[PDB]
């Protein structure tokens, strides 16, 4: 029983612990969100197929790691799926050929919120898997651990809806112009969606956000968001109605606003957070 990565590198077995680097491609789905499919990433074979058959099984206690350690879901494994983290021992994979075949494993995540997700950085631990290898000749019972690491920066969706971008930068023209914000939302299944903005406001109605510009800031002005002519104050919920697999635009537009008194030239910058909720 030996394994190698999609790039041909061999995966060591039976050390203190083995670290495997894979590419993630999360996608939102109905019921279960996909984290990483390992069938395209890990390949294993058997160098003595005529005289020994190798059995590999996923042991109990396998779970997510790192920033995903507190999440739960399911695991695809050889023709069926089981709850994750594993509370029992999974059935066996059989390796009886010298030809590399995929390790049929994929990890899923149970949605917990409306949109929202945890950001994964390259080289961060994703899951700790416990494997038990046995054979039909020896009576040996060998346990080893694989540590799954990401080699690309992605964001795992923790909810049932996703967005076009997690960070959006827009550029207003010089005072007093305005620009639209290209932000859209879609959900794997029909849902009632609404969002509310957040940040440090600077007025009574709390619709105007403070100028955060670090270098040569302009004073007496702030940033105020509006959708289709209506003004959205912070900490107030805006409803979108039913949303589905077809992307729905939020329709937000960013404008300059005047507060306090005399306005002085300089730079303007605000950072506004958008949050989603069910209805």
């Amino acid at each position: 029983f030996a394994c190698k990565t999609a790039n041909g590198t061999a995966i060591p077995i039976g050390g203190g612990s083995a670290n495997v680097y894979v590419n993630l491609a999360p996608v939102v789905n109905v019921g279960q969100n996909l984290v990483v499919d390992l069938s395209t990433q890990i390949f294993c074979h058997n160098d003595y197929p005529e005289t020994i058959t190798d059995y590999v099984t996923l042991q109990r206690g396998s779970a997510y790691g790192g920033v995903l350690s507190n999440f739960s879901g399911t695991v695809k494994y050889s023709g069926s799926s089981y709850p994750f983290p594993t509370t029992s021992e999974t059935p066996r994979v059989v390796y009886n050929s010298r030809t590399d075949k995929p390790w049929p494993v994929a990890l899923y995540l149970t949605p917990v919120s409306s949109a929202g997700g945890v950001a994964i950085k390259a080289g961060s631990l994703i899951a700790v898997l416990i494997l038990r290898q046995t054979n039909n000749y020896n009576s040996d019972d060998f346990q080893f651990v694989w540590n799954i690491y990401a080699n690309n920066d992605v964001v795992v969706p923790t909810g049932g809806c996703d967005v076009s971008a997690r960070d959006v930068t827009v550029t207003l023209p010089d005072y007093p112009g305005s620009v639209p914000i290209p932000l859209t939302v879609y959900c794997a299944k029909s849902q009632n969606l609404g969002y509310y903005l957040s940040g440090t406001t600077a007025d009574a109605g709390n619709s105007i956000f403070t100028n955060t510009a670090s270098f040569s800031p302009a004073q007496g002005v702030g940033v105020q968001l509006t959708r289709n002519g209506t003004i959205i104050p912070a900490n107030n919920t805006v409803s979108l109605g039913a949303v589905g697999t077809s992307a729905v635009s939020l329709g937000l537009t960013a404008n300059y606003a005047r507060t306090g008194g005399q306005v002085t030239a300089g730079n303007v910058q605000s950072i506004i957070g958008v949050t989603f909720v069910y209805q």
Partner: peptide
């Protein structure tokens, strides 16, 4: 705060 919006501008 699942999306962050940065609005740059000038006066």
């Amino acid at each position: 705060a699942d999306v962050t919006i940065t609005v740059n501008g000038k006066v």
